[PDB]
Design a protein around this ligand. Structure first.
Ligand code: MG
Ligand code: MG
Ligand code: MG
Ligand code: MG
Ligand code: MG
Ligand code: MG
Ligand code: MG
Ligand code: MG
Ligand code: MG
Ligand code: MG
Ligand code: MG
Ligand code: MG
Ligand code: MG
Ligand code: MG
Ligand code: MG
Ligand code: MG
Ligand code: MG
Ligand code: MG
Ligand code: MG
Ligand code: MG
Ligand code: MG
Ligand code: MG
Ligand code: MG
Ligand code: MG
Ligand code: MG
Ligand code: ZN
Ligand code: ZN
Lengths: 25, 81, 214, 100, 127
RNA sequence: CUUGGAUUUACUGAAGACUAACUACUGCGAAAGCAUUUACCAAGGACGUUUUCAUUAAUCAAGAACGAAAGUUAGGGGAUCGAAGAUGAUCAGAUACCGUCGUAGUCUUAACCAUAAACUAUGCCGACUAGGGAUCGGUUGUUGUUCUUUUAUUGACGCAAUCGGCACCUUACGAGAAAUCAAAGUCUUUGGGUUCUGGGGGGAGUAUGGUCGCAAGGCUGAAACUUAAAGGAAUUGACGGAAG
């Protein structure tokens, strides 16, 4: 896939990782 | 040109060079003897003067500074020293 | 259903005496009725007519004069000067590449308190023996030319009445003086007063207007 | 690889050039990169310059010209054949085409 | 001599306006558009429709007393194209061939001295 | 959207933006960037100099200033365009292209953010090596030229030199895998000074820790595992809803 969209997908996936870890702080 | 006299450049081509690009650098400026029209009193003025020089006798401006050589006022005659 | 042209009355447009051919043309309006007079709804109209028509000569074909009607005398409309402008094609034919365009404007009032904006335009002139492709003036020269334009338009408008100024615009008196005054700055060509705008008018003086119509 | 030594534009000794919109599609294109054509056309087609001259109330009235400067993006210009694909060696030639 | 109107011809790429006023432009004498002469939207701006539109304008002009007109051709202008539409050339030729007399001709397309942002977006309209 | 007068026409007014044409293988700036006039404020390069000081310099971990657009916070403005959204088409489907509206945004003031194909994909300083014509700034010598004003001390132009720039054309001594390059040359005949970066392709600019940020995110930054190629430039062909 396009590198720009591959980058956007990972940013959205990193965003999810941060929110999930925050549950237990 | 493979063979050329670098120590004795042609004086014609030597005069077209920049003042720092000759074999030995030498200024192209000079000093002048300025006669104001009013009187006759030798006043030494630099050719590239940055000052509005006035002669001692009469308070008349001899030259006005410019970007390069100073511009002598009307009625003022100069002789290179 | 009604054919609205049966109720139209024709009027004649008269230019001031500053021009030559004072018979500009004809206009029409709804005939004067009880509710609305034809006179009051007809004054204030602006007519844009080419200066070549007002003077006969074709040398003024590229300038067009705005005439504002401000008095009606029977079937005659007494118009006054409302503005000056160039034709679009004339201005586009002057703006070439490889040359400098310099413009200036100034707001100035006449002797009779007519507030005007006068727009001057000029271009750098290519010398007859010139070899290089472009003819550009340094920005310092353009500022000096622009300063010279402004003080000449200010002088040649504020020192005369609006009627006298109209007699100045027709032979390009101001344009010829700007070109002469800027000779020692840079050679210029096509020096024109390309536009005049009325911003504010003094209190209406019918006697002053009537003197401009015979 | 590099196709043009000029990068397809005319920006040297400059950082940024403000854009222009293609006449045909309104695409933002840098002013130096846009394909610009200055056109001076007769306002009346040569077929109609006669009958319109007869209908004129003015003896010896010159018909005004139509002045326009057109800006095209690369896609607008190539599609409309304003510019064409040239060979690798013919690309370097930047003198105006010998047509007029 | 003659009685002049002003033939304000607005020729866009979607239509053609043939609008004749007086000298001031405050009085409308005849306004016939190319869309009143055809039943297809695609040729409202056709040269043929503009010629028919101009002929109806000239006939209306004659019965009111307008014997000559000045021409003020314009394109859409503004942020859009400055070149006149295909119907503007035909409406001008039709008026001259209809017995109306022609005075000054001028292009009065509105041209900005900059301008506002033009529609289509940064990448233009992709077709 | 329109006989409740749309679109069109003239005059008048108000709002915000934006600075057309002139505008260029032209200018300025450290870069990002900078294009209406005038005034003011403080800067700057180059040039000229028989002025002055005398090594005060070059490049620079750490540490700083600035840093397009988008984005964030709070006021003000909100014309136009216009993410989102809504809608008419097209389509097998299109919540896509196309059309009509449209909110954030677009503009500005106070703060943040610190990233771009932020590109010349080419670090900075110094020296040398080849021809040519243009051009911008300064200076210096000179015309069957136009003009001040009637001439000079007018300005423009013309012809020569020169210093600095933005570039360009030819050649290849030379370099390179080639494309190409006056530097990407003076590199196995290998050493002028110095900073930064890379070590097959992925995993991955990911995880984790730290730190900065209001957030978005920025900076720093692995490993397990997986893989024989991935890639660069060019050649012949084939194909193209590319041109002739
Ligand atoms: Mg390619
Ligand atoms: Mg950039
Ligand atoms: Mg296409
Ligand atoms: Mg410039
Ligand atoms: Mg620079
Ligand atoms: Mg650091
Ligand atoms: Mg920013
Ligand atoms: Mg706000
Ligand atoms: Mg808004
Ligand atoms: Mg749909
Ligand atoms: Mg949508
Ligand atoms: Mg859309
Ligand atoms: Mg919209
Ligand atoms: Mg904001
Ligand atoms: Mg980066
Ligand atoms: Mg680039
Ligand atoms: Mg880089
Ligand atoms: Mg560095
Ligand atoms: Mg070097
Ligand atoms: Mg020079
Ligand atoms: Mg070799
Ligand atoms: Mg080369
Ligand atoms: Mg190079
Ligand atoms: Mg690796
Ligand atoms: Mg390849
Ligand atoms: Zn003396
Ligand atoms: Zn495009």
């Amino acid at each position: 896939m396009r590198d720009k969209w591959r980058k956007k997908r990972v940013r959205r996936l990193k965003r999810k990782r941060r929110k999930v870890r925050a549950r237990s702080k | 040109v493979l063979v050329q006299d670098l120590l004795h450049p042609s004086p014609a081509t030597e005069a077209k060079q920049h003042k720092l690009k000759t074999l030995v650098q030498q200024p192209r400026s000079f000093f002048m003897d300025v006669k104001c029209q009013g009187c006759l009193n030798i006043t030494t003025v630099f050719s590239h003067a940055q000052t509005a020089v006035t002669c001692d006798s009469c308070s008349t401006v001899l030259c006005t500074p410019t970007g390069g050589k100073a511009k002598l006022t009307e009625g003022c005659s100069f002789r290179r020293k | 259903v009604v054919d609205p042209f049966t109720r139209k009355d024709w009027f004649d447009i008269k230019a001031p005496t500053t021009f030559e051919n004072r018979n500009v043309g004809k206009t029409l309006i709804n005939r004067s009725t009880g509710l609305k007079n034809a006179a009051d709804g007809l004054k204030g109209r602006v007519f844009e007519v080419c200066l070549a028509d007002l003077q006969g000569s074709e040398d003024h074909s590229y300038r067009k004069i705005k005439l504002r009607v401000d008095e009606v005398q029977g079937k005659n409309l007494l118009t006054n000067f409302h503005g000056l402008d160039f034709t679009s094609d004339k201005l586009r034919s002057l703006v070439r590449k490889w040359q400098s365009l310099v413009e200036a404007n100034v707001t100035v009032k006449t002797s009779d308190d007519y507030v005007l904006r006068v727009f001057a335009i000029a271009f750098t002139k290519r010398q007859p023996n010139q070899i290089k492709k472009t003819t550009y003036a340094q920005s310092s020269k353009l500022r000096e030319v622009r300063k010279k334009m402004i003080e000449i338009m200010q002088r040649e408008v504020s020192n005369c009445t609006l009627a006298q100024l109209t007699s100045k615009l027709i032979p390009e008196v101001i344009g010829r003086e700007i070109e002469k005054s800027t000779q020692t700055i840079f050679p210029l060509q096509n020096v024109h007063i390309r536009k005049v705008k009325l911003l504010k008018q003094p209190k209406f003086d019918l006697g002053s207007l009537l003197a401009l119509h015979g | 690889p590099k196709k043009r030594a000029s990068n397809g534009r005319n920006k040297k000794g400059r950082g940024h050039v403000k854009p222009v919109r293609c006449l045909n599609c309104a695409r933002c294109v840098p002013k130096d990169k846009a394909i610009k054509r200055v056109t001076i056309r007769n306002m009346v087609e040569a077929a109609a310059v006669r009958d319109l001259s007869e209908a004129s109330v003015y003896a010896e009235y010159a018909l005004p010209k139509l002045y326009n400067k057109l800006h095209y993006c690369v896609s607008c210009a190539i599609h409309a054949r304003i510019v064409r694909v040239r060979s690798r060696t013919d690309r370097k030639i930047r003198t105006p085409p010998q047509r007029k | 001599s003659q009685v002049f109107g002003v033939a304000r011809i607005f020729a866009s790429f979607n239509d053609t306006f043939v609008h004749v006023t007086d000298l001031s432009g405050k009085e409308t004498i005849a306004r016939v558009t190319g869309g009143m002469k055809v039943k297809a939207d695609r040729d409202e701006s056709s040269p043929y429709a503009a010629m028919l539109a101009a002929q109806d304008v000239a006939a209306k002009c004659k019965e009111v007393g307008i014997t000559a007109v000045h021409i003020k051709l314009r394109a859409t202008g503004g942020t859009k194209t400055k070149t006149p539409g295909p119907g503007g050339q035909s409406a001008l030729r039709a008026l001259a061939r209809s017995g109306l007399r022609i005075g000054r001709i001028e292009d009065v397309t509105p041209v900005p001295s900059x301008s506002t942002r033009r529609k289509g977006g940064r990448r233009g309209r992709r077709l």
